[PDB]
Amino acid sequence: MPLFDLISPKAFVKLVASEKVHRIVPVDATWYLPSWKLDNKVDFLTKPRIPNSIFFDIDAISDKKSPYPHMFPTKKVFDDAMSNLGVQKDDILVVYDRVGNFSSPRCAWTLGVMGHPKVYLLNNFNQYREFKYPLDSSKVAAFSPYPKSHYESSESFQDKEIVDYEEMFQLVKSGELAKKFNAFDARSLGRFEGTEPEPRSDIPSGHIPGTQPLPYGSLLDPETKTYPEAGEAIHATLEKALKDFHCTLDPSKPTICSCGTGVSGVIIKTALELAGVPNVRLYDGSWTEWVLKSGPEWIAENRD
Template structure:
């Protein structure tokens, strides 16, 4: 079950116009790959953004005890991050990124397990901008204009949303991945097949044996990077993409989404849930964790 909803730019604008009792806070979650020199926070402060936005740093609100880049935070870390931004439990949060739907699905997924009551993913910034809706281009000095708050989430559903490393290895060793699960990997096909290097040079390319590729770009509009509007359209896009890759996601089986570090895996997780499939979880450590913790015999390169 998805813990957030997709919101079209028009519905977002309509929501802003009619809501009079609660704050609507756009949350900019723009993030770039480590081999990209751009600075997302600097661009937020000096460039364009949705009006009244705050900037959520997904490199900061995470499990800081883990050696892996983007692991779901504990409650204390999450509450501290939300409080520093001045956010409140009764805020309506609308998550977006200025790439399109790249890092914002990860941000909205990070917030989702803490059961924020009104949580949306904007679908998406590029569509919003091309429609001519308002943008803020004033220079900012802070990532939020709100005073520090006391955000309190007192529980987390992460145990239900996250698949741990041990489960993945167990499935590989038993050979049960494809009989029991759909495991889909959002990385580029050449990385999945071991033909191109990973962005982090210490990590070999390849894939979890039994996993299928689902490059995240294939579930988004090639121009706007938006998800198809309806579940029916999303399912058609998903089926077309997997058919071209030589397989089909079995709706009767639970699905595990993964990628390099848990960022783009959330793009395909959102797509699969938007298409109406149930029981979709994220392998949060993803390829970065898996490839560093197993020996070469548990790394596949050829597709079967």
């Protein structure tokens, strides 16, 4: 039972066109690196969206109480968000973002993890726009065109989907992380290697011992940022990424994805699941939490 399926623009419009039962709520989960000086909210409101889109605020729909970035939202924050956005349980949520499988996977995954029955990750809005799929180019003054709903996650899959620090640390402390898991870090190789800084000032780069660099971009088409198609394409991409970054993905091991903050970790997590890699979890705390909770002792550099 996939937490969300990728959906191509064509499959999406097919889905929309064919849908007789379920509301299809595209979910713009656009979130930008602050470095980009873009405004995801303004972009949602004022840049073309997939018709009937809600905006999924990656930032707001997170554990903002956590000292760690992009921490999975609490059930309440999530439900309230969904409610606020008028998301109904029955909605087919089709998540996209303006970047290209950047925050949308995180979002699709969040929706999925929070047990939303039907969640698609549009793969992706870039291609959707490139190929002129239906855009609501109207400027809106709402992050949702839908009346507030009473959305309540009946089930969630954090346990199956999110590696907590405790487990991450134990796995690493026990030196069993690499043994028991394919542990991939979606951050740049440079950040993984500690050769390049974390986008955070309080956090040195480097990696969790036992993890491997799988920079999320390696798993997306370089220009369109689409996930390669399931099957040969994603496998070719995945194996190439694994080759390029001298990584192992043991099909017998479950997988942990992490990154700096847990957002791009879902990008690769999604790519891995797309590639049919089973039991991929996101170390949501990711590198940031890792560093903050573990200290410099638990920071591996290069490929250590």
